[PDB]
Every structure is written in C-alpha cells, then in structure tokens.
Amino acid sequence: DSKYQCVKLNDGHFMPVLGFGTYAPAEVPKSKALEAVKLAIEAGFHHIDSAHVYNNEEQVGLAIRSKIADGSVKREDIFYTSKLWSNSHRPELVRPALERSLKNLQLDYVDLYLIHFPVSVKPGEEVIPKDENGKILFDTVDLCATWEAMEKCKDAGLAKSIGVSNFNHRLLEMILNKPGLKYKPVCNQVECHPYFNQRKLLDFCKSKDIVLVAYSALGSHREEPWVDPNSPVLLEDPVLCALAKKHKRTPALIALRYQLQRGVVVLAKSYNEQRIRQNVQVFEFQLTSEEMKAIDGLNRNVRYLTLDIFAGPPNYPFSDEY
C-alpha cells in the first residue's frame, strides 16, 4: 500500500490512473454510494469521481472521511473530483457551487474541479430546468469567464487542479487560447471505450499535455432514457471476451487495461463489493501490441451518452467530428 500508479498533470499535481465512478441511476438508494466508496477505497482505489449533479456528495464525502478517520487512507492519498453543473456557469456562481459541494462533503478542498458540460442552463435549484412547453431553459454564458472563475477557485486553494468534461476540440482551443490564461485544463473527462476510442481527441489532448479521462469505459450505466437500450453491450463483445479468456481475466479488465496502455486515465463504476475488487486487478497484467491493435479494431463510432437533450446551443459538444 502507500504507493500506486499516478500520472503527472500539467499543473504539477498527480492523478491516480484508475478512478472509481460514483454515479448510480435514480432508482438506486443514495446509501449504496456510501458503502461502495468505502469498499472502493478498501480495494485500493485512490481516485474517486463525483459531481454536484449526482446528488451523492454527502455520502461520498462521509465514505472518504470514514476511510480516513479509520486510518484506512490519508487525505493526501485520496484524489477526489467534483464537477460544476451547468446551472452555475455564470462567473459569480462558480465559487459558491464549489463551496456548496465542499460543505456537503465536509472537506476543505477537492483535488479536481471540472466544468461538467459546456452547455449552460438557467441558474436555480433545478439541474435541468424546463419551460411551459417542456423545452430546456438554456442560458448563455462565456465559458472563458467561467474558466477564469475556476482559476480563482484553484488560486483560493478550494481546488487543487481544474479541468473540463465533455469538451470537444473547438472548446478546448477556446480555453487554451484564452487571452491571459493562467491555468490550462489538466484533463478532459469524456466517454471513451473500445467502441468509441476517441483516438483523434486523445491525440489532441496529448499534444497539449491534457489527460483524457475515460468515463463509461465499461460500456456505461445504460440508464434510460440517457442511453439507447438498443446499443451494443460492450462487455459482451466477442473480441473482449476472447482476450478475457486468453488472459483468464474478464472483459471489463481488458477494457480498462486498454485505456491505461494508451495513456488514458480510466474510471470504473461498480457498487458490487467483488467487482470493485476485480477492477483493481487492472494492475496485474499487460496487453501485447497485437492485442492493443485488436481492441483498436473494435471502434465503431457509437456514442452511448449523446446527452442530446442539450442539443441546440452553439456549445453542444458532440456535433463536431471531435
């Protein structure tokens, strides 16, 4: 213990390369996140991924603080990520959103704060506000101004590092090229897996030393109406299953190891005590270059999470090629 695999971010901080996802569908009791985070820590996860919009920060924080006070882990050995929801993109709303997250977590800082999604919605308690016609109440906010507000939260010490999520090439360039930029995003957390392996965006991120963090790396939560139930089940893939047999591992383990070997930090959500343990075994084997090539072949350009309910605004990120 005490040591684990991390990568150096562009602001000098280190991020553990395997992250534990904490989102769980609405039907799942928020209490299950409490135990799942505790187990994840016990199993050796050192990186925990959440967001204000997952509505579990109370529980996630309790787990962390609970594996701390029981000396199972130290605060410096937990990399905790939160995310700014789209109803707080206005500059004067960013620090208050982070501070509310921190109050819920009862923590002094987050290790990483991301702009969760580049499209903005009307400020208020409702995370997906809708009008009388059932249409989204979008808002217009200069992301450059939101990013300047994140830089101030990092300078205030409330976030160790800042980054973004669901940003495309155009949106990343907007930040990277912003006049007077103080801090580049350390990461861009996006959907990534053998069926949507983000090779183009990945390479771009690499060229600017931005770490691409893969979510729904195991084929996603497949929650409706977010993900089409007709979409292929990743973990049933014939090639993944074959490689899983060869290595005597599982298709999940193969999908995770794949991301590690291509330079991607990978998240993995499970609320199963035993699967939580399985996933940490990603550090127990390697894939050969022929095998990597085989997984590369699986790419289909199928995106599980379109979030197309947010389509329309200029900053909707998935219309571009990448």
Residues contributing to the annotated binding site for NADP(+) = 19-23, 49, 165-166, 189, 215-221, 269-279
Q: Is 189 in the site for ligand NAP (CB under 6 A)?
A: yes
Residues designated as active site:
54
216 lies in the site for ligand NAP, by CB under 6 A: yes
Q: Which of 16, 22, 80, 315 binds ligand NAP (CB under 6 A)?
A: 22
16 contributes a contact to ligand NAP by CB under 6 A? no
Please give the residues from 242 up to 301 whose contact with its own copies meets the rule CB under 8 A. 261, 263, 283-290
Q: Is 64 helix (H, G, I), strand (E, B) or coil?
A: helix
Q: Is there binding between residue 252 and ligand NAP (CB under 6 A)?
A: yes
- Which 20-59 residues touch its own copies, going by CB under 8 A? none
How far, in Å, are 32, 118, 122 from residue 139 at the CA level? Answer: 34, 11, 5
Nearest-5° Cα angle at 199, 193 to 200: 135
Site string for its own copies, 58-87 (x = CB under 8 A): ------------------x-----------
Return the closest-CA partner of residue 307 out of 191, 200, 210. Answer: 191
Selection from its own copies, ligand NAP, none that 250 binds (CB < 5 to 8 A by kind) is ligand NAP
Identity of the residue, 62 or 189, whose beta carbon is nearer to ligand NAP in the bound complex: 189
| 281 within 8 A of 266, measured Cβ to Cβ | no
Answer whether 41's CB lies under 8 Å from 69's CB: no
82 binds ligand NAP, rule: CB under 6 A: no
Residue carrying the six token digits 């135990």: 35
Per CB under 6 A, the segment of 66-74, 118-126, 217-225, 240-248 that binds ligand NAP is 217-225
Which are the contacts of 152, defined by CB distance < 8 A and separation ≥ 6?
94, 95
Two tokens at 302? 């199928």
Piece of the chain touching ligand NAP by CB under 6 A; list 167-175, 199-207, 212-220, 310-318: 212-220
CA atoms within 13 Å, Cβ hemisphere of 298: 27
202 touches its own copies (CB under 8 A)? yes
The residue among 46 and 182 lying less far from ligand NAP, judged by its C-beta, is 46
Alpha carbon distances (Å) from 105 to 82, 109, 116, 161, 313: 10, 9, 18, 17, 32
Residue 199 contacts its own copies per CB under 8 A: yes
Binding segment toward its own copies, per CB under 8 A, in 26-34, 113-121, 124-132, 206-214:
206-214
Of ligand NAP, its own copies, none, which one sits near residue 56, judging by CB under 5 to 8 A according to partner kind? none
Direct distance between the N- and C-terminal alpha carbons of the chain, in angstroms, rounded to an integer: 39
> Where do runs of H (alpha helix) occur along the chain?
31-43, 57-69, 91-105, 143-155, 169-176, 199-207, 238-246, 251-261, 273-279, 289-296
Residues in contact with ligand NAP by the rule CB under 6 A: 21-23, 49, 116, 165-166, 189, 215-221, 235, 250, 252, 267-272, 275, 278-279, 305
Residues in contact with its own copies by the rule CB under 8 A: 1-8, 10-14, 76, 199, 202-203, 206-207, 209, 261, 263, 283-290
